[PDB]
C-alpha cells in the first residue's frame, strides 16, 4: 500500500521544534494522514504547546530473533511531563497523536519495519464472550511496552486472532532499510464518543513487526535501534477537579 | 369502506422486501452522528487498498509469518520462474486470503482491472534485475524465461527503484467472470524470472525477501450476493 | 477441498529403493503439475522432481538427478516418485505439491501434503 | 488491450450498487429461536416465558458479516416468525393462540416470573400476535448510549452495547393439551452506516 | 425443460430476457386415516440464486442464508409471489446451446419444508410452482421442435 | 386505519393476471441487453416469411425429403391438376406442416390474405407453360383446365420467369375464419394444370420439380389464445 | 423466400480484390443480409484487410446421391493465414462473415440448392437432458467439412430434429441452376455475449442441402463442384498473450 520511492539516502534536515522539543527530522516530507483526516478540536481548555509538544519513549532494540512490539495511547505517554499529568487531572479528554517513528541503519543492513495504528487495539484471547479479560496493569505496559511472539500477541494474528497479512487495512507505513528511514503517522482522534475518559480507554495502538528479517553485512552492528516519538495533537480536557496533587 | 381486493403475496414474508413498519419507541432521542474518520461506503472500496500476499503456503510457512517471505536464494539460472500465480481468485488458494479475495467471496462475478505490487527488501547496495510477467487467460503457465519474455511482462530494476506495480488488464471473454474454477474462465499467470542475476557486495547477506501487494481498481465490480458461513 | 495423500515413505536402506505417491482430489489432473521437496532434520524446504501431467516433460534436481524418478498416473490421480539407489542425504521428511505447473522452485506451488518421513538407514 | 504501464488503474467506476453498504446489510437474517409453550401442568422449566438477550453475537452468518467494521449506527428492523404443534399424540383440541412478544429497552428490569410486574410495563413496548396470520414486525431506531455501536471494544468498564432483551409468552391460559411454539427472530440492520474497518476473524467464534 | 407446455412455446426462438415471477399454490392434507389433529402450518420456500450451495439436510447451515431470499407462506391465505429479474449471466438466455464449456442457463433451486416442527398426525403436501415471464424480449428464430422431448 | 372493505375476489389466484408482487433481488446489476440481429415483436412476423410446404405426403414421401418435391412427369394432357391443395389450414394435412400453420395452431380465428409462390427446377433450356389456378371458398374443386380456367388464375411461364406468386385474396363470410373444420367457413382450392406442355431441347432428363412456399400478409391477424401439447 | 430473378445468363464479371486475394464474382448484386444487419465493431485491436479479406475452403463434389454439407464458423476459418493465427493467440473474439458460395453448371444441369446458415446450429443426437454430447474433434471437422445423411445429421430434420421445410426461418437463397450460379450472406456476429472465446463456441453453421436432384443431359460432367469462400468481416481480438508461437 505504501508504494513509494522518495530519494533513498539522505537530502534535508528539517528539525521540528515544537515548544520545548526539537527533533530534527530525516527530511520532513512522506507522511500518511489516518483516514484523510486532521486531529481537529470539537465543534474547552485547548493548552496547545503546554501539552502540544514532543515526546521520547523508550528506545528498543531489534534483533534477528525480535518478533515485533506493541503499545498503547494515550497510555504510553501517561508518564509525560503535562500530558501525564492533564490525563489524571481530568475527567475528560481527547487527543490526536502524531506518531513519528525513526529507524536508522546502514547502507550495509536489510529488512522491513510495518508501523501499524489499530484503532481500538484488544489483544489476543479468544474469549468473546468476555473480551478484557487480562488486567488493567498488564494491557497498560506504559512507556516500556509490550511485545509480539512467534497477555499473549500472535505476530501473524496481529495478536487479536486475525491474519497479519490483512493488517494492511489500518493506516500505516513500512521503514523498509533501502528507502526510508523514518514513518510518519498522523492519528486522528478515533472512539465511539465525542470525548471519553482517558485513563481507561485506550483510543489508538501503535504496533511494529518485522515483515522482513534484520541481516547485517558480516560482522557489524549486533543490532540497530528503533525510536518512537509521539506529540499530541489538538488537545483539550474537561475541567480540573480539586487539582488533587499526588 | 373503499373497495380494495387481496391479491397473492398477501401473508407471507419475504426476507429480501423492504416496507415500513411500526416504530416501537415513539419520540426516542436518537444520539446524533459524528464524524469519525474512516467512513465506508461501499465493499469495492476496501479492495482498492493493497494488501499483502502470502505466496509461500508450503508445509511448514502456511499458517506462519514466512507464508509472506518470497527468498530470493543463491541458486542456477534455470528458467524456472521464482514465483508463479494464477490469477484466478477462489479457484487458487494464494490470491483467497487476500482482503481483495475476501470481498470476492461473497459474490458470483467480478469484472475490471488488479494491480500487483512487489516490494523488495534487501540490502541498498544489492542491485540486479527480475522480470515480472504476464500471461492472458487460457495461455498455458510460461516455463522459461523466453516463453514469459514474449508477453505483457515488466522488467524491474532492483538497483534503482524498490517497488514495482504491474496492473493485471481486463482481457476477458465474458462481461462478467467466474469467481469459480471454471475453464471457460480461467485466470491465466503472473510470474517472476532472473532478467539478470542478484549482486551484493562485500558479505552482506546472500539472501533477501519480496513481499507482494494486491488490489483492485475503479473499474473492478461485482455481482449477486451470495454466503458461505459455517458452524 | 484439493487432498493430496502422501503414500510411500519409511526407513529403507543406504541404496534401497522407495517408491511414492500422491492421490490428487479436488481438480483434473491434467490442469496441474506434480512434485516433490524435501527438507532434512531442522534444514530448508528442498526441491527434487516435478512434471507436468500434460507435457510429461521432466525435471530433477541436480544432486538427485539419475537415481531418482518421476512418473504420472492420468488415470488414477497419481505420481510416482521412484526413488532408487538411495543415499544417508536423501535422509528428508518428503512432501508433494500439485504444480502451476512444472518445475523445482523455492514454493511455486499451492497444494500441500502433510508430510511423510523417510529416513535411509545405514548400517 | 494488453497493457501494465502504471496509471492510477485504468477507466471509471462499471455499477457497483448491489454491493454497497446499505445492501450488503439489506438481508435480515436469523438470529435467534425462542421456545415457549402453553402447558396444563406445572412445568417450572418451560414455565410459559423464555427469555433471550437481543444479541447478534448469537449466530453466526450475521455476526461475521457485522465483523468487518469496527463501529455501526443501524435502524434495527425485526420480524417474527411464530410457528406452533401439538407435543402429546392426543386427538386433543386448542384454539387459536395470542403470544406476548416485549422489546424491552437496553438497561431495564429483565423478567423473571411470568406473572411479575414488569411483565405488564407501562412503558416498554409489547405486540400481541395472534397464531395464523402475517408474522409480527416492530422498528427499534438507533438505541446506542454512544455515538456508534462498538463491534470490537478496547478498553475497561464482553457486554458489548446492549440491544436490549425479548421476552414472549402464551397469552391464552391453560389449557389440558399442552402446545409448543418456536419463536424465530430475523434482523435488518436497515440505513446502517460504518466506520474504521478490520481484517476479517479467519477463524471459528 | 420438466414440463411440456411451456418448454415448447419458448423453443420457437434461440435467446430471450424475461422477468421471472413465481407464485406458490401450497395444498395440504392428513395421510393416515385417522381423526388426528394439526396446527395451520407454515412453509418455508427458498429462491436461491444460480451457483450457490444447495441444501442436503434440512438442518445445514445453508438453510438459513444470510444473503439468499426465503419466503414464510402461512396455509389458508393467498399463494405466495415473488419476482426474480433477469438473472443471467450472458446478455441472453441461451434455449440452444451449441459448442462446449446440458445445464442451461440454471435458472437457480427451491428448497421447500415445513417449518412447524414434528406433530404426531403426518401431513403432507404439495407446492405447485408457475412461471409467468413478464418484460420478456427474443431473437433469431428456429422451425419448432416437431417431435416428442 | 384508512376504511377499506374486501371485495369478492380477494386471495384468488388468476393465472392471467397482472400484478406488482415483491422483487427477491434488490439492487441486483442486470446485464444490459445488446442489440443481437432478428428481434421479434409479434408472432404475425414470423408468418410473412415464405415457408416450403410439404406437398407430396404420400405413403412413402411423407417423412421424408420428398415430400417437398412435385415432380412433373410425362404422362398425358388430361385435366387432371398435377396439384390441388385445399386453403383450409388445419383442416388439412398439408397446410399444417408451415411454419404459417404452426402460427395458427395457436389461434381459433385468422384473416387477411396468403401468398403461394411457386420456384421451377428444371434445365434453363426446358420450357412451357401452366396454370395456377385459384377457386374461392364453398365452390368446387376445379378437376379440369376449362373449368379451372374460368376463375381466378395465373398463367405462369416456365421459359421466361422462373417463380410464380399468386396471392390468395380475402373472399370470406366472416370477418374471422376458423382455423377448424367447419362447412360454414371451408377455404376452397389452389391447383395447377398443364396450360401447355413441358419441352425439352436434347437429352436433357425429361422429369424435373417444382418447388411450393406459403406466407403471411401485412392484413393477416390472429385471435383467442389457445393451445395443444401433448405429453 | 428467395424469389428473386435477376437475369439468368451472365452480364457483368465485377472482382472483389480484397487484400491479397481476387474473386471475379459473377456480377455484384444480389446478396442478402441475415436480419438487416452488417458486421459492426463493438460499440480493441481491429486488424482490418491483415485478418479481413477472403479464403477459400476446400472443394466438393455434389452428385446424384449428395446428401448435403455442412460447416462451422469460425470453425472452418481456424486453418486460414492470420484469421488461422488471431484465434488461437487470443482468449478474445468477435466476427462476420461473407459466405459467398459459388456453383457453376451449364445451361444442360438441373438442380437446386439452398444455402442455410443456421445460428448456433448444434447437430443430432436427441439428448436433451445432455446436448454437445460429440467429440469437439467430430463437432469441428475444420475446412473438409461434414455431410448429412439420408455425429449424425438427418437431412429432412435438417440435422437437428426439426423438418428442413421450416429451415427457411433462417437466413437463406437458393442457388437455383436455372437462374442464379452465386450466392452471397452476410451473417453478423451472433451470441449471447458482446465478445467470447472462438475456440470453444461456434456460432454460425453453413449448411447447404439438395432442394432438388442433380440431372445431367444424357452423358456431360457426372458431377459439378460447390465452393465455398468466407470472409472475416470487422473483426477484433484481445489481447495478445505470450505469442505463444507453435
Known amino acids: 500500500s505504501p508504494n513509494i520511492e522518495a530519494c533513498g539516502y539522505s537530502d534535508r534536515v528539517l528539525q521540528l521544534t515544537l515548544g520545548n522539543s526539537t527533533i530534527t527530522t530525516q527530511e520532513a516530507a512522506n507522511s500518511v494522514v489516518a483516514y484523510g483526516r486532521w486531529p481537529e478540536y470539537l465543534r474547552p481548555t485547548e493548552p496547545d504547546v503546554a501539552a502540544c509538544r514532543f515526546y521520547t519513549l523508550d528506545t528498543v532494540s531489534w534483533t534477528k530473533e525480535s518478533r515485533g512490539w506493541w503499545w498503547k495511547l494515550p497510555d504510553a505517554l501517561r508518564d509525560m511531563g503535562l500530558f501525564g499529568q492533564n490525563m489524571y487531572y481530568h475527567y475528560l479528554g481527547r487527543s490526536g497523536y502524531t506518531v513519528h517513528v525513526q529507524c536508522n541503519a546502514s547502507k550495509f543492513h536489510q529488512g522491513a519495519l510495518g508501523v501499524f495504528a489499530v484503532p481500538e487495539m484488544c489483544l489476543a484471547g479468544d474469549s468473546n464472550t468476555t473480551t478484557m479479560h487480562t488486567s488493567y496493569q498488564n494491557a497498560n505496559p506504559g512507556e516500556k511496552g509490550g511485545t509480539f511472539t512467534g497477555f499473549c500477541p500472535v505476530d501473524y494474528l496481529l495478536g487479536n486472532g486475525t491474519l497479519l497479512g490483512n493488517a494492511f487495512v489500518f493506516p500505516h507505513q513500512i521503514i523498509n532499510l533501502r528507502t526510508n528511514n523514518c514513518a510518519t503517522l498522523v492519528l486522528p482522534y478515533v472512539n465511539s464518543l465525542s470525548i471519553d475518559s482517558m485513563v481507561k480507554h485506550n483510543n489508538w495502538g501503535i504496533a511494529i513487526l518485522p515483515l522482513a528479517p534484520l541481516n547485517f553485512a558480516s560482522e557489524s552492528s549486533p543490532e540497530i535501534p528503533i525510536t518512537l516519538t509521539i506529540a499530541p495533537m489538538c488537545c483539550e480536557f474537561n475541567g480540573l477537579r480539586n487539582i488533587t496533587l499526588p | 369502506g373503499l373497495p380494495v381486493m387481496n391479491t397473492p403475496g398477501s401473508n407471507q414474508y419475504l426476507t429480501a422486501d423492504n416496507f415500513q413498519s411500526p416504530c416501537a419507541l415513539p419520540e426516542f432521542d436518537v444520539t446524533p452522528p459524528i464524524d469519525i474518520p474512516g467512513e465506508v461506503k461501499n465493499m469495492m472500496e476496501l479492495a482498492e487498498i493493497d494488501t499483502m500476499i502470502p505466496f509461500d503456503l508450503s508445509a511448514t510457512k502456511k499458517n506462519t509469518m514466512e507464508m509472506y517471505r518470497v527468498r530470493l536464494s543463491d541458486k542456477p539460472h534455470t528458467d524456472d520462474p521464482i514465483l508463479c500465480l494464477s490469477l484466478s481468485p477462489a479457484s487458487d488458494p494464494r490470491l483467497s486470503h487476500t482482503m481483495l479475495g475476501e470481498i470476492l467471496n461473497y459474490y458470483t462475478h467480478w469484472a475490471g482491472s488488479l494491480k500487483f505490487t512487489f516490494l523488495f527488501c534487501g540490502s541498498m547496495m544489492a542491485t540486479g534485475k527480475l522480470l515480472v510477467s504476464y500471461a492472458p487467460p487460457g495461455a498455458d503457465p510460461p516455463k522459461k524465461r523466453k516463453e514469459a519474455m514474449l508477453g505483457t511482462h515488466v522488467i524491474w530494476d532492483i538497483g534503482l527503484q524498490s517497488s514495482c506495480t504491474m496492473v493485471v488488464p481486463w482481457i476477458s471473454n465474458t462481461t462478467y467472470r467466474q469467481t469459480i474454477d471454471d475453464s471457460f474462465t480461467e485466470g491465466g499467470y503472473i510470474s517472476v524470472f532472473y532478467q539478470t542475476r542478484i549482486v551484493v557486495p562485500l558479505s552482506t547477506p546472500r539472501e533477501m525477501d519480496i513481499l507482494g501487494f494486491v488490489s483492485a481498481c475503479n473499474d473492478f465490480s461485482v455481482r449477486l450476493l451470495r454466503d458461505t458461513t459455517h458452524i | 477441498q484439493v487432498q493430496l495423500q502422501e503414500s510411500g515413505g519409511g526407513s529403507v536402506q543406504a541404496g534401497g529403493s522407495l517408491t511414492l505417491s500422491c492421490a490428487a482430489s479436488?481438480?483434473?489432473?491434467?490442469?496441474?503439475?506434480m512434485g516433490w521437496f524435501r527438507q532434512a532434520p531442522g534444514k530448508e524446504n528442498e526441491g527434487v522432481a516435478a512434471?507436468?501431467?500434460?507435457?510429461?516433460?521432466?525435471t530433477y534436481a541436480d544432486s538427485v538427478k539419475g537415481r531418482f524418478t518421476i512418473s504420472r498416473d492420468n488415470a488414477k490421480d497419481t505420481v510416482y516418485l521412484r526413488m532408487n539407489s538411495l543415499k544417508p542425504e536423501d535422509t528428508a521428511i518428503y512432501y508433494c505439491?500439485?504444480?502451476?505447473?512444472?518445475?523445482?522452485?523455492?514454493?511455486?506451488?499451492?497444494?500441500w501434503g502433510q508430510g511423510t518421513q523417510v529416513t535411509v538407514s545405514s548400517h | 488491450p494488453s497493457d501494465t504501464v502504471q496509471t492510477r488503474h485504468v477507466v471509471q467506476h462499471r455499477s457497483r450498487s448491489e454491493s454497497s453498504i446499505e445492501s450488503f446489510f439489506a438481508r435480515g437474517a436469523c438470529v435467534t429461536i425462542m421456545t415457549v409453550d402453553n402447558p396444563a401442568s406445572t412445568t417450572n422449566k418451560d414455565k410459559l416465558f423464555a427469555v433471550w438477550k437481543i444479541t447478534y453475537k448469537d449466530t453466526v452468518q450475521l455476526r461475521r458479516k457485522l465483523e468487518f467494521f469496527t463501529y455501526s449506527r443501524f435502524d434495527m428492523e425485526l420480524t417474527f416468525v411464530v410457528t406452533a404443534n401439538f407435543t402429546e399424540t392426543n386427538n386433543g383440541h386448542a384454539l387459536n393462540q395470542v403470544y406476548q412478544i416485549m422489546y424491552v429497552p437496553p438497561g431495564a428490569p429483565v423478567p423473571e416470573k411470568w406473572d411479575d410486574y414488569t411483565w405488564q410495563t407501562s412503558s416498554n413496548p409489547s405486540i400481541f400476535y395472534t397464531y395464523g396470520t402475517a408474522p409480527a414486525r416492530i422498528s427499534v431506531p438507533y438505541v446506542g448510549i454512544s455515538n456508534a455501536y462498538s463491534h470490537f471494544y478496547d478498553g475497561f468498564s464482553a457486554s458489548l452495547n446492549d440491544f436490549g432483551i425479548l421476552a414472549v409468552r402464551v397469552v391464552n391460559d391453560h389449557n389440558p393439551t399442552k402446545v409448543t411454539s418456536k419463536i424465530r427472530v430475523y434482523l435488518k440492520p436497515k440505513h446502517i452506516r460504518v466506520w474504521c474497518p478490520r481484517p476479517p476473524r479467519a477463524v471459528a467464534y | 425443460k420438466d414440463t411440456v407446455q411451456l418448454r415448447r412455446k419458448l423453443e420457437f426462438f434461440t435467446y430471450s430476457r424475461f422477468d421471472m415471477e413465481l407464485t406458490f399454490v401450497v395444498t395440504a392434507n392428513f395421510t393416515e386415516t385417522n381423526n388426528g389433529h394439526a396446527l395451520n402450518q407454515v412453509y418455508q420456500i427458498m429462491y436461491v440464486p444460480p451457483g450457490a450451495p444447495v441444501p442436503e439436510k434440512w438442518d445445514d447451515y445453508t438453510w438459513q442464508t444470510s444473503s439468499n431470499p426465503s419466503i414464510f407462506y402461512t396455509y389458508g391465505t393467498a399463494p405466495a409471489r415473488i419476482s426474480v429479474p433477469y438473472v443471467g449471466i450472458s446478455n441472453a438466455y441461451s434455449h440452444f446451446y451449441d459448442g462446449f464449456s446440458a445445464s442451461l442457463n440454471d435458472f437457480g433451486i427451491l428448497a421447500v419444508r415445513v417449518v412447524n416442527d414434528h406433530n404426531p398426525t403426518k401431513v403432507t403436501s404439495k407446492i405447485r410452482v408457475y412461471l409467468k415471464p413478464k418484460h420478456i424480449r427474443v431473437w433469431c428464430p428456429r422451425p419448432p421442435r416437431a417431435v416428442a422431448y | 386505519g384508512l376504511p377499506v372493505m374486501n371485495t369478492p375476489g380477494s386471495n384468488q389466484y388468476l393465472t392471467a393476471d397482472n400484478f406488482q408482487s415483491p422483487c427477491a433481488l434488490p439492487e441486483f446489476d442486470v446485464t444490459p441487453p445488446i442489440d443481437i440481429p432478428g428481434e421479434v415483436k409479434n408472432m404475425m412476423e414470423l408468418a410473412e416469411i415464405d415457408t416450403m410446404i410439404p406437398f407430396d405426403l404420400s405413403a412413402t414421401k411423407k417423412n421424408t425429403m420428398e415430400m417437398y418435391r412435385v415432380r412433373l412427369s410425362d404422362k398425358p394432357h388430361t385435366d387432371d391438376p398435377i396439384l390441388c391443395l385445399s386453403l383450409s389450414p388445419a383442416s388439412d394435412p398439408r397446410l399444417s406442416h408451415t411454419m404459417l400453420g404452426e402460427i395458427l395452431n395457436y389461434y381459433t380465428h385468422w384473416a387477411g390474405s396468403l401468398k403461394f409462390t411457386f420456384l421451377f427446377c428444371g434445365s434453363m433450356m426446358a420450357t412451357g407453360k401452366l396454370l395456377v389456378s385459384y377457386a374461392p371458398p364453398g365452390a368446387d374443386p376445379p378437376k379440369k383446365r376449362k373449368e379451372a380456367m374460368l376463375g381466378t388464375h395465373v398463367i405462369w411461364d416456365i421459359g421466361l420467369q422462373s417463380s410464380c406468386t399468386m396471392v390468395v385474396p380475402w373472399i370470406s363470410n366472416t370477418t374471422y375464419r376458423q382455423t377448424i373444420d367447419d362447412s360454414f367457413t371451408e377455404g376452397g382450392y389452389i391447383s395447377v394444370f398443364y396450360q401447355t406442355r413441358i419441352v425439352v431441347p436434347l437429352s436433357t432428363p425429361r422429369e424435373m420439380d417444382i418447388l411450393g412456399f406459403v406466407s403471411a400478409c401485412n392484413d393477416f391477424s390472429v385471435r383467442l389464445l389457445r393451445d395443444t401439447t401433448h405429453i | 423466400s428467395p424469389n428473386i430473378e435477376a437475369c439468368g445468363y451472365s452480364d457483368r464479371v465485377l472482382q472483389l480484390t480484397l487484400g491479397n486475394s481476387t474473386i471475379t464474382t459473377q456480377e455484384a448484386a444480389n446478396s442478402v443480409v441475415a436480419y438487416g444487419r452488417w458486421p459492426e465493431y463493438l460499440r480493441p485491436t481491429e486488424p482490418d484487410v491483415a485478418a479481413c479479406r477472403f479464403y477459400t475452403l476446400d472443394t466438393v463434389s455434389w452428385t446424384k446421391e449428395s446428401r448435403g454439407w455442412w460447416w462451422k464458423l469460425p470453425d472452418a476459418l481456424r486453418d486460414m493465414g492470420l484469421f488461422g493465427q488471431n484465434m488461437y493467440y487470443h482468449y478474445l473474439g468477435r466476427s462476420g462473415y461473407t459466405v459467398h458460395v459459388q456453383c457453376n453448371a451449364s445451361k444442360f444441369h438441373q438442380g437446386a440448392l439452398g444455402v442455410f446458415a443456421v445460428p448456433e446450429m448444434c447437430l443430432a443426437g436427441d439428448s436433451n437432458t445432455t446436448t454437445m454430447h460429440t467429440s469437439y474433434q467430430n463437432a469441428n471437422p475444420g475446412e473438409k467439412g461434414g455431410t448429412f445423411t439420408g455425429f449424425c445429421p438427418v437431412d429432412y430434420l435438417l440435422g437437428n430434429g426439426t423438418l428442413l421445410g421450416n429451415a427457411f426461418v433462417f437466413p437463406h437463397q437458393i442457388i437455383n441452376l436455372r437462374t442464379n450460379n452465386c450466392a452471397t450472406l452476410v451473417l453478423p456476429y451472433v451470441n449471447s455475449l458482446s465478445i467470447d472465446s472462438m475456440v470453444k463456441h461456434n456460432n454460425w453453421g453453413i449448411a447447404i442441402l439438395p432442394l432438388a436432384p442433380l440431372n445431367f443431359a444424357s452423358e456431360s460432367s457426372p458431377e459439378i463442384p460447390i465452393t465455398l469462400t468466407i470472409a472475416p468481416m470487422c473483426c477484433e481480438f484481445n489481447g495478445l498473450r505470450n505469442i505463444t508461437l507453435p
Open positions: 505439491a500439485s504444480g502451476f505447473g512444472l518445475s523445482l522452485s523455492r514454493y511455486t506451488y499451492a497444494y
Open positions: 479436488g481438480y483434473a489432473v491434467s490442469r496441474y503439475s
Open positions: 512434471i507436468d501431467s500434460s507435457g510429461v516433460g521432466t
